């Protein structure tokens, strides 16, 4: 049960380290980013500084499937 | 709230023009440049949201807003208005007509308009006060200062402008930090996609 | 709305020609350059959409528009006109004939024309007013200023022009921000392809 | 606690303006710049958390805070308030209305507000005292000093500003070290994810 | 039993070397980082200095499975 629910949480979701000055209304950004069709409008010059680091969530899908 | 006096004083000091007698830059020029800076700041950060709920009939067909920057939601009798246009389409889907700070409905229908938009409240006097968070001070200076540095007073004015651009970028980062801390959710995890 | 006086004043200040007596650049030159800037700005951003709904018969065959930039939709008796041409084809498919600010229909048919196009409303006097959003001020200055910097007053005029080009690019970015906030949908997700 | 006298003395020494008679930089300017530095420092590091627990009724509808930086938790009768807005929505979900240092509830309901927020306690006199950890001294100097170095006293002021930026970064690293040692858990291992 | 519990600890958890000035409230950061949907807000300019080193935890999952 733990492996099935954790694998259902791993896919279908994303994790990211934000800086505290990356974008205005970061909760709004992670609401529209959770969709599979995301049109997220950010502040200007927010794609060249890399203040958001999307971490790889599914580094453990295969091992949990085998277990 | 920011007083115009302190913005003006900082700009005068930074331009090596903090002389009461001389004033090589007229205060009308500074107030116009501050209006321009307020324009750019309020547009980029969507600082001021305003709601107007009026009624349009066959007598008066347009809704005169003020210092319009953008419309983010329109309701007509609690019905969503979808598209925006400036052409006065005769018939078809129901669209919002924008006429350079005049708002109406394109295939006109009697009713009421509830519109959410953005505003300036620009200034006209040196003794006025800018109703903005104090954190917005440095972004007002460094943005109006880049507008004045490109007067050809010195042969090295553009490098100084380039330095002030980076300073302005840092000020905008601070402002974004403030805005996120104010008007954004305090969340630490995302939600799973539900389809 | 932008007054021509403030555009002119900013250009004069930037050119180190803010002297009432001298005026090394004649005001006719500035008004012509401002007309050129309005041309380029209204063409690139498609700022002004105009709709003209007239009738063409055998007596008068052409529709005289004004300050034409482009046609984006033509209807003839609520029938779409498809192709555009300037050659006066004798017969065949029904095409729109463009004759340098005169509009007709190529294999001519009696009827009416509903045409959507783009316009200048250029200026001719220093006391006039430009009916454009105030955010368009900096793009008018920095674009007309690059047109005048290339008078060979100084040996380092082209580097200054290059700096003003980047400033103009930033101004255009601001203008695009404004236009998207005004005349575009407030959406946050795309739609699935339906075939 | 940091006395303002020692911050002022260090800034005067660093600006080569440690002369009692002359004082090329007025003390009003220094106190305003110190207020700006306190703003930025308290915003970035969330130094000061304050709790206010008041009551809102139909007579007085707004809660006037002071030196607001951000809201991190709102309770209304021990009920979580979820969203934040500045538009005065008529009805719907229950949201927190922020009016530039005035707090209310958007679809207004009688009750009490327990709000956690952030504060300045800015200074106004040279003889005052800043209630901050002493480790925050160097970040106050190096941050207010970068605000004054960009007065065009010298042709090499911006390189000096760049050096002081790195010094400020190191000071902020020290401050983060202190804050983690104070207000953070002393842990050495993570916990397993429990889903 | 040791291999099963150690493999259940290896996946589902992360290890990292922190500097003592990497981020404020490092215990709070490792609480929100342990989730599979992590939105961790850090201090500004904390993504360009690399004061956090996430070490690879699952270098021993396959060998423990075989054993």
DSSP-derived letter for residue C134 is: G
CB contact under 8 A, B188 and E32: yes
In chain B, which residues have their Cβ closer than 8 Å to the Cβ of A26?
Answer: 180, 184-185, 187
Q: Is D99 touching B (CB cutoff 8 A)?
A: no
Q: Which two tokens stand for residue D91?
A: 């009805």
In B17-165 the beta strands, taken as DSSP E runs, fall at 49-56, 71-76, 83-85, 95-98, 103-105, 111-118, 129-130
Which of B164, B174, B185 is opposite residue D40, by nearest beta carbon? B174
- Helices C157-183 and B157-183: crossing angle in degrees, nearest 10, is 20
Phi, psi of C132 (to 5 degrees): -140, 160
Cross-strand partners of E55: E15
Contact A19, E47 (CB under 8 A): yes
Phi, psi of B86 (to 5 degrees): -130, 25
Classify the C-alpha dihedral D96-D98-D101-D105 as positive or negative: negative
Q: Is E43 touching D (CB cutoff 8 A)?
A: yes
Sheet holding A52-55, edge to edge: A52-55, A15-19, E39-42
- Best residue of C177, C185, C188, C191 to probe chain B, by most B CBs closer than 10 Å: C177
CA distance D167 to B49: 39
- Length of chain B, please? 195
Question: Among residues C114, C177, C123, which one has the least CA distance to residue C2?
Answer: C123
Q: Is C187 touching B (CB cutoff 8 A)?
A: no
CA distance B189 to B191: 7
CB contact under 8 A, B138 and D36: yes
Closest-approach residue (CA) in chain A for E4? A67
Give, in degrees to the nearest 5, the angle at Cα B154 between B10 and B26. 45
Task: Write down the H helix ranges in chain C.
Answer: 4-14, 27-45, 137-148, 157-183
C92: left (phi over 0), alpha (psi -120 to 50) or beta: left
Please return the burial class of D134, using the count of CB atoms within 10 Å of its CB with bins 0-12, 13-18 and 19+: exposed
Closest-approach residue (CA) in chain E for A9? E36
Q: Is A11 touching C (CB cutoff 8 A)?
A: no
CA distance A49 to E45: 10
Contact C153, B152 (CB under 8 A): no
**Greatest CA separation found in chain E?**
45
* Resolution value, angstrom units: 3.6
Quote the minimal CA–CA distance from B189 to chain E in Å. 5
CB contact under 8 A, B87 and C49: yes
SS3 of residue B55 by DSSP: strand
- Best residue of B188, B190, B191, B194 to probe chain E, by most E CBs closer than 10 Å: B188
CB contact under 8 A, D195 and A6: yes
DSSP-derived letter for residue B56 is: E
Other Cβ atoms within 10 Å of C87 Cβ, number:
8
Q: Is A50 touching B (CB cutoff 8 A)?
A: no
Q: Which two tokens stand for residue D194?
A: 């429990």
SS3 of residue C49 by DSSP: strand
B51: left (phi over 0), alpha (psi -120 to 50) or beta: beta
Please report, for residues B102, D9, D27, D119, the alpha-carbon distance to residue D124 in angstroms, rounded to integers and kept in the order given.
45, 16, 10, 15
Contact B90, C73 (CB under 8 A): no
- Best residue of A17, A51, A61 to probe chain E, by most E CBs closer than 10 Å: A17
Q: Which residue carries 């750019």 as its tokens?
A: B40
Quote the minimal CA–CA distance from D195 to chain A in Å. 6
Closest-approach residue (CA) in chain B for E29? B188
Give, in degrees to the nearest 5, the angle at Cα B16 between D37 and D165. 35
SS3 of residue B156 by DSSP: coil
Phi, psi of A53 (to 5 degrees): -120, 100
Task: Write down the H helix ranges in C46-136.
Answer: none
Q: Which residue carries 């994810």 as its tokens?
A: D193
């Amino acid at each position: 049960n733990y492996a099935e629910n954790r694998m259902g949480n791993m896919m279908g979701s994303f994790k990211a380290m934000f800086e505290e000055d990356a974008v205005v209304d970061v909760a709004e950004f992670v609401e529209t980013m959770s969709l599979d069709n995301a049109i997220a409008k950010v502040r200007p010059n927010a794609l060249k500084d890399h203040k958001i680091q999307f971490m790889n969530n599914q580094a453990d899908l295969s091992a949990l499937s085998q277990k | 709230m920011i007083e115009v006096s302190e913005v003006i004083a900082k700009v005068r000091e930074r331009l090596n023009d903090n002389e009461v007698g001389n004033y090589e830059i007229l205060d009308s020029v500074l107030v116009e440049n501050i209006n321009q800076a307020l324009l750019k700041i309020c547009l980029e950060f969507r600082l001021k949201k305003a709601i107007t709920r009026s009624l349009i009939t066959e007598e008066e067909r347009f809704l005169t807003l003020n210092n319009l920057l953008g419309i983010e939601s329109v309701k007509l009798d609690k019905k969503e208005i979808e598209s925006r246009n400036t052409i006065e389409k005769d018939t078809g889907e129901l669209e919002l007509l924008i006429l350079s700070d005049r708002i109406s409905v394109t295939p006109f229908k009697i009713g009421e308009l509830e519109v959410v938009y953005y505003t300036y409240e620009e200034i006209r006097n040196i003794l006025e006060t800018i109703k903005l968070p104090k954190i917005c001070l440095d972004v007002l200076v460094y943005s109006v200062l880049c507008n004045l540095l490109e007067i050809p007073n010195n042969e090295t004015n553009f490098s100084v402008l380039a330095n002030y651009k980076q300073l302005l970028k840092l000020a905008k980062d601070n402002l974004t930090n403030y805005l996120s801390l104010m008007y954004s959710k305090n969340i630490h995890f995302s939600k799973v996609v539900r389809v």
